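To whoever picks this up:

The nightly regression suite flagged Non-structural protein 1 as changed. Nothing in the input moved, so I suspect the structure step. Input below, exactly as stored in the fixture:
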Amino acid sequence: TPASRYITDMTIEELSRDWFMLMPKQKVEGPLCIRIDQAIMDKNIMLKANFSVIFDRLETLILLRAFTEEGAIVGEISPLPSFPGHTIEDVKNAIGVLIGGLEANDNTVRVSKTLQRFAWGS
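Regenerated output under the current build:
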């Protein structure tokens, strides 16, 4: 896919950084894996993603991560190697799950400008 149709909210370093969970929680929602640190509470969180776009919409997610204001990664949506292929509907469903999980822990959750434009929001 052309560079103009590849969205990169995250830097190479942000994509590849290991991250940590004091109290890990995992949910497989269709062909996507959702993970959260249940110990993270009372924070403002931003969802950021790297993904292709076509016809004005998200096409294929590479990776989405949840960042605190301090820039710590506290959550993730990742495609599963065992299920190649997902749709924007799968992605939206996963985003709903991650947002629900983080908000249950009294966090306030925002999504990036590009995620809002290409996937999240009616």
